[PDB]
């Protein structure tokens, strides 16, 4: 209702860096909020694309940011009569960034990996990897749960089971309040997709530089399947967490599988052992139902609701004609031991090719009326196609169909304004939560502040 559109703050990265592809609020030990920005096409120190992360301190004037430095040197280890190799070129460091306590986790989903052994190899493949940083100490750690030392032939001999070579770990990511890092790896198990979880503390304590293949004993990975419904489902394209089984002691995970069951798409609510609690099926093929997932209590009953985005949903129109506009599905959580039902509300975009529902951000209580609110992105929406972010306030009945406020892109065409969003954090300490929007095409991030 009251994000200020006139008094924006622009943070900028280098040209062609995709500064703003991903972002999050990060809070230091003192409590001072900053903004972590991922820039997955940033040139490294040798003029080759590696990606990078920037840690922006809060300023009204905005501007340039300092780089959160990470090791961009390739590694080679000759051990156990094998040769391990990491390849950081075009790895897309900062394709996802997430913050937790005093830690920042930035991932490079397309970091490649190979293992040579005489004339054979595992194959040079994008296992992905996450770089963990604790800025106030300087400590660095990595996590790359899909690396293996199994050779090419053995996979063939076992019908490509448990094949983690193409995981792209860190494609999506989220952290629980306790400090469990959960990564989406949609290329997992020969493109079915998997999730990998491990405590942040245990990632840090088990990592040493140069080892490349190490054990994180507390880690837990999801499972391979022979159910054709899961084939090419990209299970883990998006990931989120919340409370969906009533037991406050346990944490539930929400996984997006946008191409699940022959491109029908699906989102799953799972326990922390990766057992399915519920499955939400997509409405229309190729709509990418599961591209985005968001969890927040919007109707004020204290039960987390679920929001799923299908940005390529084609809407019906006069004379049997379809129109790609995007759609978002609201699922309110009922009382007792009951599953989630049909959508309580369908929010459909209006601009052709707008990709409404490409990003869904919980805003917290933007106007302090008692109900939590959300922001939905249409990165190519608005009359001109420059992009749009629509604010929806919560109420007892769920959400309003009509947005409370529309944010038009201040950047030129192709910025992808809204492709990434984040809220629920008061960056200027005025008591109201604020919204940060990324425009990777324009190499920038816009900060909208909330007012009385």
């Amino acid at each position: 209702l009251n994000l200020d559109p006139v008094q924006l703050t622009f943070y900028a990265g280098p040209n062609g860096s995709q500064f703003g592809f991903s972002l999050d609020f990060h809070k230091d030990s003192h409590g001072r909020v900053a903004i972590v920005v991922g820039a997955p096409r940033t040139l490294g120190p040798s003029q080759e694309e590696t990606g990078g992360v920037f840690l922006c301190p809060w300023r009204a004037e905005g501007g340039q940011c300092p780089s959160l430095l990470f090791d961009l040197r390739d590694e080679t280890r000759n051990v156990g009569s094998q040769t391990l190799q990491t390849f950081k070129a075009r790895q897309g460091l900062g394709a996802s960034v997430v913050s937790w306590s005093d830690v920042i986790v930035a991932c490079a989903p397309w970091q490649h990996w190979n293992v040579l052994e005489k004339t054979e190899e595992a194959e040079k493949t994008p296992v992905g990897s996450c770089f963990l940083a604790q800025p106030e100490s300087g400590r660095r750690a990595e996590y790359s749960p899909c690396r293996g030392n199994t050779l090419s032939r053995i996979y063939v001999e076992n019908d490509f089971s448990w094949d983690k070579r193409y995981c792209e770990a860190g494609f999506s990511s989220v952290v629980t309040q306790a400090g469990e890092l959960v990564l989406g790896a949609p290329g997992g198990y020969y493109f079915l997709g998997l999730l990998a979880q491990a405590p942040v503390a245990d990632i840090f304590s088990s990592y040493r530089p140069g080892i490349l293949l190490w054990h994180v004993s507390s880690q837990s990975l999801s499972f391979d399947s022979s159910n054709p419904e899961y084939f090419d489902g990209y299970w883990g394209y998006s990931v989120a967490v919340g409370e969906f089984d009533g037991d406050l002691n346990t944490t539930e995970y929400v996984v997006g599988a946008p191409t699940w069951s022959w491109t029908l798409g699906a989102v799953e609510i799972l326990d922390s052992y990766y057992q399915r609690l519920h499955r939400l099926r997509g409405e229309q093929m190729a709509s990418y139902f599961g591209h985005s997932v968001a969890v927040t209590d919007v109707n004020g009953d204290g039960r987390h609701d679920l929001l799923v985005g299908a940005p390529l949903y084609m809407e019906s129109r006069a004379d049997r004609k379809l129109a790609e506009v995007g759609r978002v599905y609201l699922f309110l959580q009922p009382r007792g031991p009951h599953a989630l039902g049909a959508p309580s509300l369908l929010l459909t975009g209006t601009q052709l090719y707008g990709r409404f529902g490409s990003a869904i951000a919980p805003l917290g209580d933007l106007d302090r009326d008692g109900y939590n609110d959300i922001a939905v992105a249409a990165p190519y929406g608005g009359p001109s196609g420059r992009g749009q972010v629509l604010v929806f306030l919560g109420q007892s009945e769920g959400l309003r169909s009509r947005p409370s406020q529309v944010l038009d892109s201040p950047f030129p065409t192709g910025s992808a304004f809204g492709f990434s969003l984040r809220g629920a954090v008061d960056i200027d300490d005025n008591g109201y939560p604020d919204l940060i929007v990324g425009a990777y095409g324009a190499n920038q991030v816009a900060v909208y502040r909330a007012q009385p």
């Epitope: 000759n78 009569s81 053995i154 088990s206 140069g210 080892i211 054990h215």
Partner: antibody, heavy 119, light 108 residues
């Protein structure tokens, strides 16, 4: 607390076989490679081989190929070493080993199993 | 196979001394070396992995160093518990191979 619990001392006859066991406590045996090592007062430490209990695949020093068969069972969280065609050279203390973090390391050791081959 | 030659086979040293045990590989093993301790009549404990990394719980007075084919384990300010046997193991290549051993012994 990671701890490898090996089976008790063996007194066996030449030409026979023996099978030593190594049960994981405080962790799952499929978590890492499990190695088997031989120790003798004069000859010192010799590496016999390893198993990846997740999939059963093994590696052996050519010296022990044929004599040693390493196996593992994830149902009982136990790894095994079987020595066939026992000789006086097989009188030794046998250890199972696993790494802490580094896949390839030799960090945690069992308490050892003594085998004595005699008539 | 890689031959690991450990030196000395024994040394006679005192409490509070700083001592080094060396291990020479027959070829480069780029830090793929571990150091092990065996106390009298006891089993093995890992001290260092990958050349310089202390195993969890190992006291700071132990340290590893070296590169290529030549490595050292240094114990600083010997404790009475440190009078034991020490072995290097390489895992650069299969078969893994061990050094001969070094026995720390009380000087009198």
């Amino acid at each position: 607390e990671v701890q490898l619990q090996q089976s008790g001392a063996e007194l066996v006859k030449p030409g026979a076989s023996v099978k030593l066991s190594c049960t994981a406590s405080g962790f799952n045996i499929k978590d890492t490679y499990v190695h088997w090592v031989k120790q003798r007062p004069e000859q010192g430490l010799e590496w016999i081989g390893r198993i990846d209990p997740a999939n059963g695949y093994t590696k052996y020093d050519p010296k022990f190929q044929g004599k040693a068969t390493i196996t593992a069972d994830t149902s009982s969280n136990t790894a095994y070493l079987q020595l066939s065609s026992l000789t006086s050279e097989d009188t030794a203390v046998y250890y199972c080993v696993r790494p802490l973090y580094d896949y390839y390391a030799m960090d945690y050791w069992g308490q050892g199993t003594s085998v004595t081959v005699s008539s | 196979d890689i031959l690991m030659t450990q030196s000395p086979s024994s040394m006679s040293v005192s409490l509070g001394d700083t001592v080094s045990i060396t291990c020479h590989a027959s070829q480069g093993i780029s830090s793929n070396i571990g150091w092990l301790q065996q106390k009298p009549g006891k089993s093995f404990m890992g001290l260092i992995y990958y050349g310089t990394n202390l195993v969890d719980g190992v006291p700071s007075r132990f340290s590893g160093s070296g590169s290529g084919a030549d490595y050292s384990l240094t114990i600083s300010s010997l404790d009475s518990e440190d009078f034991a046997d020490y072995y290097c193991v390489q895992y650069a290549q299969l078969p893994y191979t061990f050094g001969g051993g070094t026995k720390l012994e009380i000087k009198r």
